[PDB]
Every structure is written in structure tokens, then in C-alpha cells.
A paper describes a structure:
We developed an anaerobic isolation protocol that allowed us to purify a complex exhibiting 20-fold higher hydrogen-uptake activity (6201 ± 1445 s−1) compared to aerobically purified complex from this study (253 ± 164 s−1) and previous studies (2.44 ± 0.62 U mg−1 ≡ 13 s−1). The structure of the anaerobically isolated complex was determined at an average resolution of 2.6 Å. The formate dehydrogenase subunit FdhF, which shows partial occupancy in the aerobically purified complex, was entirely absent in the anaerobically isolated complex in multiple replicates of the purification. In line with its higher hydrogen-uptake activity, the map derived from anaerobically prepared sample had stronger and higher-resolution density for the nickel-iron active site in HycE and the proximal iron-sulfur cluster G1 in HycG. The ND3 loop (HycC TMH15-THM16 loop), β1-β2 loop (HycE β8-β9 loop), NDUFS7 loop (HycG residues 69-80) and the ND1 loop (HycD TMH5-TMH6 loop) are all well-resolved in our anaerobic cryo-EM map and could be modeled with confidence. The structure of anaerobically isolated FHL shows the arginine in a single conformation facing the metal ion. Additional density between the helix HL and TMH7 of HycC could be confidently assigned as cardiolipin (CDL). Arg567, Tyr290, His215, Gln220 and Asn571 of HycC interact with the headgroup of CDL, whereas non-polar residues in the broken helix in TMH7 interact with the alkyl chains. In FHL the Glu193 is too far (4 Å) from Cys531-S to allow direct proton transfer, suggesting that the β1-β2 loop is likely flexible during turnover.
The prototypical hydrogen-producing enzyme, the membrane-bound formate hydrogenlyase (FHL) complex from Escherichia coli, links formate oxidation at a molybdopterin-containing formate dehydrogenase to proton reduction at a [NiFe] hydrogenase. As the pH of the growth medium drops, formate re-enters the cell and synthesis of the formate-hydrogen lyase (FHL) complex is induced. This heptameric membrane-bound complex catalyzes the disproportionation of formate to CO2 and H2 allowing efficient production of hydrogen from biomass, a process that was first described over 100 years ago5. The FHL complex exhibits the characteristic L-shaped structure of the complex I superfamily with membrane-embedded and soluble arms. An electron relay containing eight [4Fe4S] clusters, coordinated by FdhF (A1), HycB (B1-B4), HycF (F1, F2) and HycG (G1), leads from the molybdopterin site to a [NiFe] hydrogenase active site in HycE.
Author numbering:
A (entry chain B): 1 to 170
B (entry chain G): 4 to 253
C (entry chain D): 2 to 307
D (entry chain F): 2 to 165
E (entry chain C): 2 to 605
F (entry chain E): 5 to 82, 84 to 537
The structure:
Amino acid sequence: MNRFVIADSTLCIGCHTCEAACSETHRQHGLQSMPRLRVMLNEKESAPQLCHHCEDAPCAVVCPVNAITRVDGAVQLNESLCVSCKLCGIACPFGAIEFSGSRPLDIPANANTPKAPPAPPAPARVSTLLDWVPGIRAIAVKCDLCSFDEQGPACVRMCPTKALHLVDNT
Amino acid sequence: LLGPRDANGIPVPMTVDESIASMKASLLKKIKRSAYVYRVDCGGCNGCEIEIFATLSPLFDAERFGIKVVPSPRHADILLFTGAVTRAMRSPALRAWQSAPDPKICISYGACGNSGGIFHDLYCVWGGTDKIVPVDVYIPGCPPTPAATLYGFAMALGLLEQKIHARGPGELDEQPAEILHGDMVQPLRVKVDREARRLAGYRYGRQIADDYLTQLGQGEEQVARWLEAENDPRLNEIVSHLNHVVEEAR
Amino acid sequence: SVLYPLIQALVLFAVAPLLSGITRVARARLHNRRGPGVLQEYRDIIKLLGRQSVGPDASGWVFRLTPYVMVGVMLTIATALPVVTVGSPLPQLGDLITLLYLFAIARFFFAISGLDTGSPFTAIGASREAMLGVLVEPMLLLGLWVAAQVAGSTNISNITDTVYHWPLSQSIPLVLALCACAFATFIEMGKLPFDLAEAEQELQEGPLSEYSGSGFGVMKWGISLKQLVVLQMFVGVFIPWGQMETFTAGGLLLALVIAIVKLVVGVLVIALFENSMARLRLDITPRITWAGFGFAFLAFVSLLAA
Amino acid sequence: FTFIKKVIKTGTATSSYPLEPIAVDKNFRGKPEQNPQQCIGCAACVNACPSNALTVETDLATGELAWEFNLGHCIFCGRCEEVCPTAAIKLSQEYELAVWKKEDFLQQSRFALCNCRVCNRPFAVQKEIDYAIALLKHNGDSRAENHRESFETCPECKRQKCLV
Amino acid sequence: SAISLINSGVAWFVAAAVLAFLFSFQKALSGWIAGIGGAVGSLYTAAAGFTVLTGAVGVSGALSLVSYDVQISPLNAIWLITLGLCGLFVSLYNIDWHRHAQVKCNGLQINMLMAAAVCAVIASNLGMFVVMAEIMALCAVFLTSNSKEGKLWFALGRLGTLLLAIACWLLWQRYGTLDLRLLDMRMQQLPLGSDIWLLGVIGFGLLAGIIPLHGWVPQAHANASAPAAALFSTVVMKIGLLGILTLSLLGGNAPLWWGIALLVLGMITAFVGGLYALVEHNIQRLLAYHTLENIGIILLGLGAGVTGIALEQPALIALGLVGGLYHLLNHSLFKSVLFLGAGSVWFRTGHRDIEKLGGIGKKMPVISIAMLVGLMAMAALPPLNGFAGEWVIYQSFFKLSNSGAFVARLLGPLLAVGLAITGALAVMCMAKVYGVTFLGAPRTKEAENATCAPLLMSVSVVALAICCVIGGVAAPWLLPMLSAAVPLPLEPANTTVSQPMITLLLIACPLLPFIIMAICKGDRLPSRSRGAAWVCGYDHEKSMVITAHGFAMPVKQAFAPVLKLRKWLNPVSLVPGWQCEGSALLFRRMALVELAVLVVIIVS
Amino acid sequence: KLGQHYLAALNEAFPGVVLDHAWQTKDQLTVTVKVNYLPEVVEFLYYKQGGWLSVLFGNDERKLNGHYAVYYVLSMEKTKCWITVRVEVDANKPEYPSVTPRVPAAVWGEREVRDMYGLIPVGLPDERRLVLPDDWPDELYPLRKDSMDYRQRPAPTTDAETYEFINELGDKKNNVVPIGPLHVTSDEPGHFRLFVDGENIIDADYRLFYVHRGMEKLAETRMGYNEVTFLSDRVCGICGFAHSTAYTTSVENAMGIQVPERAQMIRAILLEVERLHSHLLNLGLACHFTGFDSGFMQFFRVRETSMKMAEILTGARKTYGLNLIGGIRRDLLKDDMIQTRQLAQQMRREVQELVDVLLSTPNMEQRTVGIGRLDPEIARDFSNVGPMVRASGHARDTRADHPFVGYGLLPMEVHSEQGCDVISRLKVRINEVYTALNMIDYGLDNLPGGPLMVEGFTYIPHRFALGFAEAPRGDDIHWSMTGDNQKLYRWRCRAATYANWPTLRYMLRGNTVSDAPLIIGSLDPCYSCTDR
Ligand code: SF4
Ligand code: FCO
Ligand SMILES: [Fe+3]
Ligand code: NI
């Protein structure tokens, strides 16, 4: 009674094409461009892990702003409603939520001019459940099944080995 | 150069010689009942400046404490600094500091003056009044209220004592957080609080949702008798939507 | 006789900053505010006397010497003013020309201090100080002159005695010269709408902008004493009936009480006038000052007619 | 004079502050009070602060998250109270906030971090994990009633368990 | 006797002029000779004046140099004291004035001016007074900077002799004599006509500078040397007043309108000179207009005296004719102070414009103090020597006000009102002059590199300022010594002024705020002179310094018709040959022909 | 679609010059024209079509279409709509023809795009540095997206000011009277150079942008959409809610966000509460500058009633913090309705007594009548806004010409005068107090019901519109481009006195130094609004 994308480890080669394809379709839409499926590699096989779109959905239980609902059999997190409280990343038992925020638009990472002393560097990244940069509002980033896109999930379409497919159990 | 700079040419705060700075206690004693204040707007948004004007108002009257706003820095005992010190306002602020009799009391007024405020890291400012001149008194607020300005002036002149103090890390830090409204379902409380913020805003929504769920924990007759006491139609509108949310949850 | 005139000079200097306190209290009451006490100006002068006197680098001894010169000039005027007696304490300084040219000394020194600092605001305020002094002298001299003509003498003692033993037949020239001298007293006290030199909100109170510390304190004290001696020239000559013709120790207390009440009522009426309007400009002031010269000329014509 | 009637008709409008307090509205946005017990170190308020009055620093050496509120930075907008999940931070009606030392502006907290069960790297505030565990226990959860070590695991290590 | 003293003075002046002309190949030696001889001749002239004023009787005699009849009345002894006390320090100034590379020898011109002036004072015949006044006027117009600045002086100064020669011919025809003693006896039955008096007053005011016959005065003073300009303002313009007072007081019988005309003309001269000075930036043109203001005050005194003679009121005669003459002598003193000090500032800087002359008070401090004394003396601020004669003229104005004659009662308060206006304008002008010259920052590099004045310059200016302070403070004693010239008691109307009480009270009374600042000075940090003036936090530019142009714009607005009267009443386009190319040069050539033939015929 | 007839007239006059046109709102049209026909198009829409130049600005769109973009927003006021004239400027050669030789209102944004963007308006008569300070380094343009980091603070190139001032009507024989940056009347820093002949202003130049902090760079680097609402509250502490509302209804206008009807009227009410304190601040300072310090005290005593209303309605006295994108953050329960209704009726009887003691002030008529005259055709050419142009006879007002928030449902009356002097600019502001009290009294009696915000919406990237609020000193035009779901791409703010300052020179000519603080105060200057 839920819709999600699952990966096959015996078919996946760990090329990270799906991570780039998921990043591009959300960057064009203005959403968070962090990849919502992450490729994990034991030394023997590999498969990207993403949101299971659970029936009980413990992330939606602990959300203090009700940003996480169920739409069309899919657990959907409202990115504009999230207040970055990061409770959903603890409650998720599958590690499907990490935390990234939008950086300034079309401004390079090293934008320092030689005409001034350089800007203070960013703090060292420990964990997205703990990091905070003053210009960056790191909100919860999970798979939304590319529901804005008419072609469906971009990770499934751009997988060369067809290791990803949707499980439409509705 | 009007102000001191570092090896990179970036301006640094002006020090005050120890012989001159050892007289600030005596100046603070003798300006208790007669204080002359020169306002130095170093690049604020005018919010701080016009609550100083409202501290000269008939309602909030600062002259009864012996505080007179002076036309020139030459007359000043207290130099009142507002603003994040913009680049075009560094040199006039230092000129007002230098064309004033020594010793001088510096009151940093407002968040912008205290640390830069909301512009604490911008390119065309310096980040507060302590980045150019030493500061005796910090008055926070964006802008401070004229009551806060009166309190800061009276605390600088020694008529009143400082009330707030720093809170360091202690042991409450590890005493665990309590669940809000633990006698009810927490996603329902989230939905009720979000619906009450939609209709009433964050400030009234939290007050209305907390009161409504407190009355709902006792009974529906308890909610209805609470609405009769308030006798506000807008609150009846909001509690009707909250009841609709509670009924949709059931 | 070398003590009455100096005792009067010491008494007026010491109280001059209390009449400024009535002025600043009545200003606060007309601003609908509680305001400070009557000793705020003294509290402000004593604080400034222990404050460092600074100045511009392009200034010399004139800038440092002017406040003490103006205080000494006002003390010199105050020894010759009838306060508790009808006659002057020092009648050889009591000529109206003498007391008019003594005031010109302090306006000259005020104007050269504003040209010594090099500021545009101080120099423009010096320029207004001297120009208001230009504009007000015809009316003040013609009023005092008409009173001296109705008194047979330019001495302030004899003018005060003639207003005291008021003549009645020469009532119209005396009343019109009194109105001219009252208006002249209001302009010479630098009171709004004629505060064209120390015009904060324009010149950062003019030549006072460069003064600091003890120099600013002695300047504020000289301004207060100048206002006191101008108002005392009016109210101790044209309202002399609380004074006494011969000095007695028994009648001294009532004379000081009536002199203090006259000064307080004068600064209260003056406060009611200055806190109730906008200040003028220097290009429109001559029409109003020529109109006071008019009250004085009407006085002068009413002496020629009769 | 119309000005003199106006002055006489008004009277004295000056209050007696500081002798008698000056009333501010029940919902006046004064100083943000902060309950350190109710705070879970979630930095939701830190992410919503426009003037960066709220800062967190991850101090690995002390194994803690350094929560801090700076009153000299605060623009008194109330967004911390708006986005707070536990309602730990709230704007009071206090306005008498002037200091002599700007260190007195600081409201500091230090919450112990939680090391991951698998990689022993500090990944989250232990207080926030305890609050999430209590929240799931309140809604009826067995993963919270029996398995706290799954909540004290980092999301990368929780993604490694799904690989098998 | 005083006749031998004045003969020695005339001989020393003539020998000084001759040996200054012959030894003019070395300018320093010529200046030393001219200054020493002029100082000795001025000492003899002042000694003769003091002798005649102390003896309280006129002396008679003749000069041994040429056949020149001499009467020295006590009235003319004040002019002798004036001339000697000016020319002594003017010549001692001239000694170090001849050390400048850009100046020329002038001691022949200066000492011939002094000799002709002294012989005009001690003149017996009115025709001879008109001869020595023109010898002085030619020796004065040759002291100008160039031919362009003495063209109007040659035109007006000879016009005034054509009128004086017509008046003297008319006196010869009506009385058969020009001796002043004989004319005084012959006009106790037949009075002096008003046509003769009008011609003489217009001709002498063309030399004394009565406005509007004053047109040569600022041109003449504009770029002349400092001893020359000081002698113009203190000697040459005072001989015309001597002629006016001589002609007005012959017969002791004056018409009423003579004194009335003198008072109006004096009021016109005083107010117009004091107002026109406040619109000048050349210091010497300003001091020329201020010489005109003081000439107007001396006539307000002399006209009050003549009006009292006409109304037979001896108190008015005494007050007017003592205040005017005391103001005349003390004006000469402080006008000499100001012209010599401004010339010292020009000596050290090269500038007569005070807009290019900032901050001289720190570079020339002794000169700055003496100039301050002179400028306060000219504003008639007590207890200096300008207030001493002006206070007495106000007492004469009060005597005019309480008279029976309706014209005296009408003019009396009005002349006092005008004198108050003139004094306030004077205070404004001296505030401007001391502020933009000796105060503030320097405005040119010449004002920065000014050093102290030379020794005899400083001695002359300081000694003249000391004489100004003496004539101010000791005025209650020096004023009754003029009762020899006017044998009448001085009666102010139930009032008195004591300048020593004002002197002691303007120094002791400022010590009291100093005493209280020294008591209430707890830990006040010492005084600071650190930076620029406060211009609201911006950088202080040179254009933020308000100068003499912007200080006196309100008097250009509030006295617009009087300042515009200088352009409507000017008959410069109505004279046909005035705008010719070589008119000033031809005026100069026939000036030396007239001076040459006059010197040739007067030795005969 | 409003402005179709204007687009047809533009295509009829200059065939082919319009390349691309699009509608962002039903009353907002943006046309893309050829770069070298830009001064003819803006002059055509300015004089032939009777438009008013609201804001002109640059946009670093080199990563969108490879070109710098200069927008030229024209307010059609002969229904009324907006026309934005857009050109594409080459990135390698940032040169475009200047509109200032044809439209005199174009002098300052063309000076601003030199400073913030480095574009070169060819033919601009005044190339003086305007927005950047004197110690800012050359060829360092902060609003370019790759030129510099927003946290970088360069070393000052100088400590003394290097700005050059223009004295047209005078000579070097004039003195200068520096009013500001730290004058008594300088409530906020602004330096005014009075080229005087004594006490008569021959000509007047001025240096501003002392208060410039770099706010438009902060809005696209460290701030999110909802954080600029509090940043816009700090553009100017006097009209901060005007900036807050103009920013909020430009993101919402770009996205088509349907704000609830209750939030729009409370936005319209608090824009009038902000108007109440600002006009009494100006009227009190107008009394203050003439020496009438009692009128300064009287007007600031009544101003505290509106500050009490602002504290009741918003929770703060001045910096309201009311607007979020999609709605407002506070409701009005009855103690809020009851107290503010009492205070608004208290304010009306109490302002009326102050106007009587202001028009009967003994020297207020000779200080204000005929002083600081703004010539009406000078005000048309430079596109002056608000009470300063409404006193000059041009009855233009945003709340009426371009209706926004809940102003279509409020009793609006446009107040204009015909005398062009200090007193009439006060008389516009006096009459606007009574109209603001009328809309507050009606608004507090006729509030709609329903929610206060919408939320959960997503921002579509690279969407833009105009945001306009009528600030107390005239129109406040904001232009926001959405960058992604969290951050903006470009936020331009143009305040009222930015359109009103360039005619201060003609207003200060022929007056006195004692009149000069009053003439500046009559412009009702908001320096922090101008500088940002
Ligand atoms: S602290 Fe706030 S109100 Fe004060 S100047 Fe800064 S931004 Fe404006
Ligand atoms: N009012 C206001 Fe502020 C300005 N100028 C805006 O917009
Ligand atoms: Fe881990
Ligand atoms: Ni503003």
C-alpha cells in the first residue's frame, strides 16, 4: 500500500549516475540538489539506499510542523515547511534523511577577491544532524519520488544497469 | 589616518591611554545628575535614532535625570553610538570621538551598534561600535524601547543596577526535555498547533492551541465554557477550525 | 561703597544660573514634561568646570580668553545696576552710554571668538551676534534716551528715580519708551524668536559649538549672567517701586524678595514668549526691529509734541 | 494663544519610570528567555535567526554542542519562538537589558553529543535522540521501547544495514 | 617760547626732507635720515603744542626760516599735539619701513607734508592756511602708489582750492584783510556770509573728507605706503577739519543752520563711512572709510559746539568742542596704530587683502595685541580712547535734546540713534577685521611664513597703543586739560564716567570665574588644541572658513538703499574728460608744475 | 492583461525594437527591447505615454542567459499598469546607451549600476560614485555574483573623503556650509554642501550613502525568503513595514501566492499606523528645525499613541516583524481591537488640536510659505514621488493608482496641493494623517475572517515581479527574483527619497542657510531608505 524506489545490488555497479540524476532534476525545480539516494558499498556489492516510504512512517510522527504527510501512497516531506529541527533523521531507521540547504545562487564556493582579505572559512563538517553554517538553512532532504516530474523518478530512468525500479504497491 | 589599522590595513578599535581611562570612574561619578549626550548614528536604519528622540518625548523624559542631548561633541560627556559603523561612517564617528573632551563615556545603543545586528558580517560595515571605539555600556534592542533607553541611561549614570546576567552551561542542559501536552496524541497536537498558527499566527496560535488543548483534556463542556468567558468571535472562529481538525483526526 | 557694588556683583553672578533654571523648568512645563530641577544649570556648570577644555588647533588666546572676558564684562555691568536701591551702586558706571558700550565689548569678544575657531557655524553665529547687535541699538538707545529726557539725565540712577517718582504728565513717552526697552531687553537676552546666533537646529548653537569643558561652562555662566543683567536693567529701572531710596539694613530683605520675584516673573513671561513660536531669520528680523524702533520713535515724537 | 490652552489642557504626561514600571503589551517582543531543560539542541531556532543571535558549535574535544544566545545580536523578531519544536525558547516582556560587560548578553548551553553505535563518531545531540525516543514511545512504538541503539546510530550507518 | 620750538620743528622737517631727497641713492640711509629728522621735528611740534595748551594763552611770532606770521592759539595746540604725536612714531616706523625691497623713498614727501601741515596749523593768514594746506595736499598726493590712485585726489583737491581761493578773495573784498586775528575783530559787527562759509566748508571737506566729498579717500589710501596712509588719515584729513573749525568759530556769532548743517553732514559722514567700511576687503580702504567715520564723529562734536554757540548755551559749546577735539587727537592715535600695524602685516606678508591674511596673531603677536587695542579703541569700547570723546559727544547730543530750539530737540535723539548705529557697525567691522586677519588658520603661504615685525616698527606701534590706553584710562584727567582751548566748564547732565573704575573692573572681575574654575577643577585634564574645527564629521576644507566677505553680507541686505546710493549719486559718466587715457598722468604733471611754482613763490 | 495598448503603441512607433514581452502580473508587463534603442523606448513611454520612472537597476544574469540585464520600470499613469523595459548588456563589454540625456529621472540608477555592477551607461553626464563609499576600492562591484564575497571587508583606500561636489550657479568665491553627516538636524547621516554667499544658498550639492550597508547583497547570500522580510524591516526604521510589505508582495506577485483577505487588510492597516508616526515625526521635526521645540514635543507626544498601537498590533513598537511570505504572523483579538480603536479616536481629536497650534504659530508662516519651492515640471522630469510631488500638483499615489494588499477595500482619498513650498508638503502630510486615521477606523471595524497565511508553497526559480507599497514619503518599488526554494536571486529596493533627493538642489537654490534644514526636512528625508 506504498510507492517507492528500490535498488538491486547484484545489478548496481556503483557508478553514482543516479546520485547525479536525482541531484539535477531537483536543482532545475529549485529544490535541494543534494542526492536523495546514497550509494553504499560493502566490498562485495553495492546499492543506493533511499526512502522506503514506510506505512507507519516514524519521520512523520515526530515532525513538529507536520511537514511530512502521505500523498498518493508516498511519504512526502514539505521542504518549505521544514524548520530544520532534524528529529526525522533520528526517527528514520533506514538513514534516508540527510540535511542540506541552498547555497547562494550562481555564486562560486571560493568567491574571495584579492582586493580584500578573505572571508572566514566554513566550519568542518561533522554530521548533517549537527552542522550549521550561517548562510545555509539545512533542511531535511529525502526522496520525494520526483513527484513534480512527469517522467517519474530520474534515478530509475538514468540507471544504465536498470538496478532501480519503482514498486507501485497501491 | 584618523583611526588605527592593522598590518592588513583593516581598522582596529581605538585604545584609550591608561591615564585618561583611569578617570572614567570619576567622570561617571560626576555625570550622575548632569549628563551631556551626543548622538553618533554610525549607519543604522534610523530605528535607534528615533527612539532616542522618543526618550526626549514628554512621556519618556530623559532630562529629569539630567540628560541633555548636545549639538556638538565638544559639549558631550557621553557619546551615544548607534549603527553597525558603515565604511562611510567610520571617519565621522572617529572625528566625533576625537573632537570631544577626554575622558568620554561610550554607550553602544542597539543590536547594530552592539555587534552589527542583522548586518554583522556585511562588506560595507565594520560590525558594531566596539570595532572602532571602546564601549562602556551596551544597550540591546532593534530598536530599544524608550523605557529600555531610560533604563540604560540610568544604569550608565549609576541610578540603577544591571539586572540581566550571563547564563553559562550548567546541569539543566542535561535534564531531559518534557513532552508538551503529554495527555494527548502528539501528531494531533502538532496538527492543532499548526492550524492555530495558520489562522492566528505563531504568537496567538501557540496561546490559543495550548489553552484549547488544556480545555480539551478535561472535556468538550470545558472547551465550550472557556469560549463563553472570552466572548471573542475571532477566537470562536479559530477554535471552530481547531475542533474541525480534531474531528478529522478522530 | 566699594562693597555694595561688589557684593551686588557676587550676588548676581551666583544666582544668574538659577534664573536659567527657572527658564529650563518653564520650558519643560511648556513642553508638558516633568523636566529637571531648578539647579540643573548649576549642576551642569559645576560638572563642566571639572571637564577638559578643548579647542581647534587653529585657535589662540582669544578663544581661551573670551568666556572670562564676557563674565567680567557682565559683572562690570552688574555692579552699576539698581537692584535693591533706586540709585545705582556704582553711579559713575551708571551712564546708559557706558552700559551700552560695555555690552558692545562682550559682543565684540563673542564675535572674535567665533572667527578664531574657523568653523562655518561659529563664524556665522558670530556674524548673527554682531548683526542683531547692529539692529537692536537704535531702539534700545531711543527708549533709554527718551527716559533720560523725561528724567533730565542719562544716569541710570536718575532714570530709575524718575520712573520711581513716576511723573504722570510724561506718562505716554515713559510707557512707550518702556515698551521699546522691554522689546530691546527681549532681543538682548538672545531669547527666541531672536536667538539667531546660538541657534541650535541651525548653527549648533553658534560660537558655543567649539567651546568645551571649563570654557563651555564659563560661557554658559556668562550667557546666564548676561540674560540676568539685561533683564535686571529692564526690571530694576522701569519697575523700581520695590526698591528703596536710602539704604537701610531693615528694608534690605523686602527689596531682595521683590527683586527676586520681579526676576522670576520676568523669566516666566519671557519663557511663555520664547517657548511658543518659531525663530526668525536674519533677513526678516529688521522689519520687526524697526517696529520697536517705531514704539521708541513714537515715544520720541510724543516728547516733541508736548 | 492656542498653544497655551493646548499646554494647559494636556498637563504633565511624564511617567515615573524608573519608580513605577512602564507597561508593555502582554505579547510585547522582549528578551528571548530560554529553558535549557526543554531545549533538545536541535538548532531549529539557530537556522531561523536572521541576525545570527543563535549559534551552535560542534566541540568534538568536549563531546558537546555549544548552544549560545547573544542578546547584543538579537533583533527581537521572535522567529526562534516561532520555529521552536519543544517551545524551549520564548520571547518575554523584559526590556531592561542594558549591561556593563557584553559577556552578560550570553545565554549559553552545552548538550552532550551522542556517538554512533557503529562508527563511534558524534552525529547528533543525545537530548534530541532522547526526545525523539520519548515522542515515538508516546505514539506507541516498539523500536523505541526495545531498540534505542537504532536511534543512536548515524544515518550513514543506518544506510549500511540496508545493504546486507 | 613755543614759537622757537615750532620754528625748530619746521626747520627739522625741511632739513629732513631735503637730506632724504639728496641721500636717496641709499634707501636705508635716506630712511634713517628722514625718520630721525621727522621724529625730532615732531618732538618740537608736540612740545610747542603742549606748551601752548599748558600756558592757556595764544602766543604770537614769526618763523625765522621765511616771512611767515604765526599765531598759535590753544585751539590749534591740540592740532600741534596731534601732528607731533603722530609724526614721531610715523617717522620712527619709517626708519624700518625703508628696509623693504619693494618700497621706495618717501621721506621728502612725508616731511614736506609734516612741515606744510604744521605751518597750516600755526597759520596767521587764511590765504596762507589755504597755501600750506595745498602744499600739504600736493605733498600728500605724491605719496600715492601710482598716478591712477591720485587722479581723483588731484581733481577734488584742486577743486577745493579753487573754492577756497574764491572764499579768500571774497574775504579780501569784504573785509580788506585775511589775518584771522583781524577777521575775528572785524566780524563782531558784520558777520561772515554763508556763501563764504559754504564755499570754505565745501573746499575744506574736499580735504577733510566730508561725505559725499570723500571720493578720493579710499582710492588714495588703497595701495599707499603705511606712513603715507597713516599721515593721510591722521594729519591731512584733520587740517580740513581745522579749517572748518576756524571758519565756523570766527566772530563767536554763528547762524543756527551752520551747526545744523555740520551735524547732518557729520552724521551722513559717520554712518556712510561706518557702513561702507564693512563692505571692504583691502584693510587700508577699510581703514580709510573708518577714518571717514571718525571724521564724521569729530564734526558731530564740532557741530554740536557750533550749534551751542548759535543757541548761546555754554554747556553745549563745552561738551561738543571738547568731545570733538579729544576724539580728534585720540582718533589720530589709534588710526596711526591701525595703519602702522596693518603696514607691518603687509611688510611681513605682502598682502593688503585680509582674505589672504589669516592667522597673523600667532606669527606677529606683539603687533596683534597692539592692533587689538587699536581696533577696540575704534569701536569706542571702554575704557579706551575712542569712548572718551564719543561719550562726551553723546552728552552734547543730550544737551541738544533738552534745548528750546525745536531743531535741536528734533535732531538731538536722532543723532544719538545714528551714533549708536555707527558704533554697532564699528563693533561688527572690528570683529571682522580682528577675526579674519589675526585669528584662525593662515590662508596663504605668505601668512604662514610671516615673522615678527622689525624693532622700531614694533616700538612705534606699541608706544602709540600705550598712548591710546593712556588717553583712554586717564581721560578724566586729560579731558579738563582741553579747557584751555575751550574756556568753559564741562557739565554732563547729572552723570559721569570713570574710565579708571572701568579699567580696574574689566581685569579684576574676570579673575573670579578663573578662581572658581581653578577651585572646581578637580581632575580636569589639561587643555587641548588638537585638530580642525567641527564641520559635522566631514573633512575641514579651506572654503568652510567664513571670511570677511561672508561675515558682512547681512549689512549688505539690511542696508541696501544706503549701499546702493554710492552708484546712483555717482557723477562719473557726466564728467567729459574723466575717462581719457592720459588724464591721471596729465594731472600728475601739472601737480608738479603747481607744487614747483607754489614753492618758488612762497620762499619769496 | 493591462498594458496591451501601450505595447501596441510601442510596436507602432519603434517597429522590431520589442524582442520579447511577458506578463508577470495582470498589471505588470516586461518588454525586452534592443539595447541601442533603449533611450528612445523609455523616452517614448515617459513623455508620449505619460509614464513615471520608478526604479532602474542591474541584474547579474550571466549564468541565466550570458548577459547583464538592466531593467527600466515605468509606471503608466494615464488602466494604470507597470512597464519594465529590459535590455541585455554584453558580459565582456558592459556598455549600454544612457537614458539620462533623454530622461532626467535616470541619473541615479545609472550611477548605481556603475557602482554595484560595473556597467557603463554611455553618455551619462554624471559619472560620480554614488552608492559605494569613498574608501571603497575601484573596479570592485559588490552586486556581481562572482566579484567578491559578501563577508569580505577591504582596507580603506583613504580616510579623508575624496568625493567631488558640483557648484553650477556659483564660483570658487563661495563658502561651503557642511550640513551633515553629524549635524543636529542630521537625524541620519547625510552631508549637504551649501555653496553660500553669506547666508544665501547659491547652489547646493550633497553627499549621501553613509548609511549604505549592502542589503541587496545580504538578501541573496545569507538570507532566505522569510528572513528578507525582517531584513526589509531594517531598510529604514521609520518605513520598515513599507519595505517589508513591498518585498513580500513581489515574491508573492512573482509566484501568484493568494494571501488571505484578513492578512491583506491588517497589512493595509499597519501601513497606515506606520504612516501615522512618520508624518508626526516629520511634522515634529519641521517644528524642531524652525526653533519651535514645543511643537516638536507636542507632535512626539501624540506620536507615542501610534507607537502604542504598533506595539499592541505587532508586538514591537517600530520593527514590526509582521510579514512572512504568504501572510502575516499576528492576529487581532478584541483587546487588540478594543485598545487600538480607543487610541485611533484619541489620536484624531489630538492631532486636530496640534494643527491649530501649528498654523497659529507666530513665525511658522514666514518660515514655510514660499520656501523650498519644487517646480512642478522639474518634479515631473525627475519622477518625484509622494507628498513632495503631490504638493507640486501631481496627485499620484500608489494606493490609488496601483491598488495593493487590502487598499481596494478601504476609504482612500488622495491629498494634493498646488503651492509648491515647505508648508504645502506639511499640509499634504497633515491631510494624510486624517485619511490614515479614517482607513484605520474603517479597517478595525470591517476586518475579514479566515486564515492569516498560506504555507507549504514551493518557489519556482527565476520568477520575478514588482512589489510596490506607498511608503509615508512616496512609492516604495521592490523587485524580487526567486532563486530556488530557499534563497532569492536578486532583490532590488527603490525607496521614496531615492526618487525625491535629486530635486533638493533646485529646492535649496535661492534660500537661506537657516531655511536649509527645514527644506531638507520638508522633503521628509529618509536616508536609510535611500542608501540601503
Ligand atoms: S539596531 Fe535595529 S533599529 Fe537600531 S539601527 Fe540597527 S537595525 Fe535599526
Ligand atoms: N517613507 C519612506 Fe522610506 C523612504 N524614502 C520608503 O519607501
Ligand atoms: Fe555511524
Ligand atoms: Ni524610510
